């Protein structure tokens, strides 16, 4: 049930797989979580030239994360008097003149912003690529990177990889469960959607669009949006793996608590703004902002969820009327009129008034009555003048008079005198105490008797081909904080007992690629022999002893991917009408073996044609 790393022999096939995609640059490996951890694991222990370069980088990244100026004054002297001043006395300071002048110039004036050592970041990188990055690829740490990268590119999730627990959310198209990923033990939420509930309710467009929207946002680790780590589907369910939020939504808590005060709503307001800022920096309009779509974690902090109605406006702006009645902006209800992020800020003012006075500002149960009352605004006397100024600016009907739509985005709302007391860095760090702390576990804390009588055709399943997805930044972070350390240690022990127990057949020759595959002998006996294959420009050998049999590139006629027992395998056709089927241990291996074998026989057969001694004559 745990993670098994492949043997280091996986490096041969993986390094070519990555090089065909340009994934072996410094800009692409350094910016990966597991890659950075392994790269520094090499620079700190396995090398002395770049050890002070990385520790300099790590001391700067610590300094960026300092909260107060009182701490930045004490840190800037230490970093300067150690990684700049001491290196400069030994003359081995490999940095430009402008870098030292910028840091020293600020220290004399004693102005220490979190971006003080940013000029060094550009140069520490330049000194780590092209030279130290090449010695790193030779080392055993980059092999370990190939082992881990093979696991990531071989992810195929099903319901059996999660231990599903209680229900924490009920909707019109499915349920949301709290689950644990047994792979690493990370707690998640599972959003299951019924395809048969999707076909009847004509909701095929929403589920498809929700996955696209989750993919745009689930990067960068936003604490105020419910982000996605994986997406998979069973023959009758769609499954999203999302942040765990087992505290109900606000639409439920608003009934149990009543309306919130200005100070209690200020908390929920600030966090929702930072979440909207994250979607707007990624060109996503939510246009469904209502208390039902704001969940609470175990501590009381909130996130935005259900991006089904959100659309992308990075190239073309929407105009259709989509949202919940009472929160839709005036330009949203008007079909034919375009709109951008301005729709969210109006929905915010609707939701924030509902937390203060218990109902939508435009209320008392007819939809057409709400559409008209807000199309073309009185505020109670129990509102502070700063709160009035915020809602008045947020609920302006004209798009040119509405706060947050005047050219600066979310920064305009932050500068409202209603938030004059907040430190938004402390808001982002979730440092402000939430007003309502959810209980230990209630029922239907996220809700709103007919069934169906229909089945799913093959044509409906074709809309869910490209539904599987794995967010790379999420999986690496999940592993880095759980088992990345203890697994590396266990694999180091197994690879050490193997070397202490055991001459390689590939070095010194002209080998292209080597590794493990499984050829089939007698199919009726489910016979699968696992041999170590060596690919040469003219032949393909394998052993288990020295290689006793092989297969020449002249024999190969075609290479085809086929299915054998619900598993993807390679099919080779031989000159004598014979067939030869191989099976790999992972998807990247099968993709790489197929590509290299196709190129090997096509190039060998074209070369033999022009050699009179080797070619075939009548």
């Amino acid at each position: 049930k745990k993670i098994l790393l492949p043997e280091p022999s996986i490096r041969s096939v993986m390094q070519k797989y990555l090089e065909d995609r340009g994934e072996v640059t410094f800009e692409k490996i350094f910016s990966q979580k597991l890659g950075y951890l392994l790269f520094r694991d090499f620079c700190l222990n396995h090398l002395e030239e770049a050890r002070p370069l990385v520790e300099f980088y790590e001391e700067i990244k610590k300094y960026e994360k300092l909260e107060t100026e009182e701490e930045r004054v004490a840190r800037s002297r230490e970093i300067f008097d150690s990684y700049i001043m001491k290196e400069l006395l030994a003359c081995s300071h490999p940095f430009s003149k402008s870098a030292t002048e910028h840091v020293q110039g600020h220290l004399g004036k004693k102005q220490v912003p979190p971006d003080l050592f940013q000029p060094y970041i550009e140069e520490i990188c330049q000194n780590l690529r092209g030279d130290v990055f090449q010695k790193f690829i030779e080392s055993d740490k980059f092999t370990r990177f190939c082992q881990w990268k093979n696991v990531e590119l071989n992810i195929h999730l099903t319901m059996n990889d999660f231990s599903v627990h209680r229900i924490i959310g009920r909707g019109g198209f499915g349920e949301v469960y709290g689950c644990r990923k047994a792979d690493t033990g990370k707690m998640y939420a599972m959003k299951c959607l019924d395809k048969k509930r999707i076909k009847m309710k004509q909701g095929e467009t929403l589920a498809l669009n929700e996955r696209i929207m989750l993919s745009l946002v689930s990067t960068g680790d936003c604490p105020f949006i419910v982000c996605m780590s994986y997406a998979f589907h069973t023959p009758d369910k769609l499954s999203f793996i999302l942040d765990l939020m087992n505290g109900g939504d606000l639409h439920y808590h608003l009934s149990q608590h009543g309306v919130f005060s200005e100070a209690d709503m200020r908390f929920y307001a600030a966090e929702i703004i930072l979440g909207l800022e994250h979607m707007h920096n990624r060109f996503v309009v939510y246009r469904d902002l209502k208390p039902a779509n704001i969940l609470l974690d175990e501590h009381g902090h909130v996130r935005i969820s259900d991006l089904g109605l959100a659309c992308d406006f990075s190239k073309k702006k929407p105009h259709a009327s989509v949202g919940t009645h009472g929160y839709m902006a005036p330009e949203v209800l008007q079909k034919g009129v375009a709109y951008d992020s301005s729709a969210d800020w109006f929905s915010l003012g609707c939701m924030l008034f509902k937390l203060l006075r218990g109902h939508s500002p435009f209320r008392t149960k007819d939809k057409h009555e709400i559409d008209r009352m807000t199309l073309t605004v009185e505020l109670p006397d129990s509102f502070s003048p700063e709160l009035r100024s915020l809602l008045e600016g947020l609920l302006q009907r004209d798009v040119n008079r509405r706060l947050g739509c005047l050219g600066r985005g979310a920064q305009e709302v932050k500068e409202s005198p209603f938030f004059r007391s907040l430190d938004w860095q402390m808001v982002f760090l979730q440092k402000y105490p939430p007003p309502l702390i959810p209980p230990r576990g209630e029922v239907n804390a996220a809700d709103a008797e007919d069934t169906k009588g229909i089945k799913l055709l093959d044509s409906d399943q074709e809309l869910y081909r490209n539904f599987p997805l794995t967010i790379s930044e999420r999986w690496q972070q999940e592993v880095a904080e759980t088992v990345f350390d203890t697994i590396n240690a266990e694999t180091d022990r197994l690879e050490a007992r193997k070397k202490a127990k055991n001459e390689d057949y590939a070095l010194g020759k002209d080998c292209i690629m080597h590794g493990y595959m499984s050829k089939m002998g007698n199919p009726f006996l489910t016979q699968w022999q696992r041999r170590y294959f060596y690919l040469f420009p003219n032949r393909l050998e394998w052993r288990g002893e020295a290689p006793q049999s092989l297969l020449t590139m002249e024999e190969i006629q075609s290479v085809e991917e086929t299915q054998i027992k619900e598993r993807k395998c390679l099919l080779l056709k031989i000159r004598g009408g014979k067939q030869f089927i191989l099976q790999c241990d992972s998807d990247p291996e099968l993709v790489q073996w197929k590509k290299e074998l196709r190129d090997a026989y096509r190039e060998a057969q074209q070369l033999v044609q022009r050699v009179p001694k080797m070619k075939n004559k009548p």
């Binding site: 020759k509 002209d510 032949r539 290689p547 049999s549 092989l550 050699v611 009179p612 001694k613 004559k617």
Partner: protein, 339 residues
């Protein structure tokens, strides 16, 4: 024009050579030997079968001890077989998979091979504690190495697909002499017994006789209708035989400067891959693409016997220096010793 004159002059010289040759054909070899008794159905059996070589065999060569032989295979390996016990003495893994030819040195201390890597590799065998490794990589050809043969432990002659041959100083790796003259891929070369001359057959359908020490071409033999794949000297050094894709072997005399005999039959249609003479020069053995080796009477051109082994092309053969046996290499991964 001068280029027109030099073409007409080269044309008249060709006619002059043809007439000078036709002036020496008073009789034929068939008439001269029409009195000696035939050899008589030469029948040989397989005595040893050399098993190994995971793919096709492209070339072999006997050692001067008439006991050890080396072979070059599609599996990128050289194997130095002990023919008396079929024990693999050395198994040399090559740095390149595309190997086409090999050779055993007269002293038995070195072996050489090469191919589409365009390099002749000298592998040493006398270094202490086994581990036979490259002692020199001879680089200079701009085409595939097709054949190579040692003179001594310090000089080796090579033929390549760049339409040239060459003579190397093994100690320094220098290309001492280049033998230009062919207009197609040079395929095979054979050394004269005195090692002062060597012949070479090529894809221009012509063989050529070269002076090793003077580096020039002495005589050029036409006659074949397609590529010349193999060439072998007569035991005394005055004549040689060639094997071609035209399904014929031909005997050429040096002192007569023309062809003497054509070895052909109406049933044989496929081309020849290798040729060799028996010790006395009476028998001409030729490997064919129909998986057979044919034994010819070199003096009467009759077919004596057929070595009917193997299941694919016979790619190489060779007689020992004592004439005790004949080895054959095939595309079916096997070597057989006939006697």
């Amino acid at each position: 024009s001068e280029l027109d004159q030099l073409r007409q002059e080269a044309e008249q010289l060709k006619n002059q050579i043809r007439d000078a040759r036709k002036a020496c054909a008073d009789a034929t070899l068939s008439q001269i030997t029409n009195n000696i008794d035939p050899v008589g159905r030469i029948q040989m059996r397989t005595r040893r079968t050399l098993r190994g070589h995971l793919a096709k065999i492209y070339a072999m060569h006997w050692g001067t001890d008439s006991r050890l032989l080396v072979s070059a295979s599609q599996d990128g390996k050289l194997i130095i077989w002990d023919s008396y016990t079929t024990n693999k003495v050395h198994a040399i893994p090559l740095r390149s998979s595309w190997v086409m030819t090999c050779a055993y040195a007269p002293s038995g201390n070195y072996v050489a091979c090469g191919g589409l890597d365009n390099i002749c590799s000298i592998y040493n065998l006398k270094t202490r504690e086994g581990n036979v490794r490259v002692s020199r990589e001879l680089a200079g050809h701009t085409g595939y190495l097709s054949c190579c043969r040692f003179l001594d432990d310090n000089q080796i002659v090579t033929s390549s697909g760049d339409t040239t041959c060459a003579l190397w100083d093994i100690e320094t790796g220098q290309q001492t002499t280049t033998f230009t003259g062919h207009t197609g891929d040079v395929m095979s070369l054979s050394l004269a017994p005195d090692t002062r001359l060597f012949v070479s057959g090529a894809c221009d359908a012509s063989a050529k006789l070269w002076d090793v020490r003077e580096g020039m071409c002495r005589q050029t033999f036409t006659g074949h209708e397609s590529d010349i794949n193999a060439i072998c000297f007569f035991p005394n050094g005055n004549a040689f035989a060639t094997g071609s894709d035209d399904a014929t072997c031909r005997l050429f005399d040096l002192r007569a400067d023309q062809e003497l005999m054509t070895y052909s039959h109406d049933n044989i249609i496929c081309g020849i891959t290798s040729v060799s003479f028996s010790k006395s020069g009476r028998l001409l053995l030729a490997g064919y693409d129909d998986f057979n080796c044919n034994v010819w009477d070199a003096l009467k051109a009759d077919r004596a016997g057929v070595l009917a082994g193997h299941d694919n092309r016979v790619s190489c053969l060779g007689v020992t220096d004592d004439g005790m046996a004949v080895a054959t290499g095939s595309w079916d991964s096997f070597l057989k010793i006939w006697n």
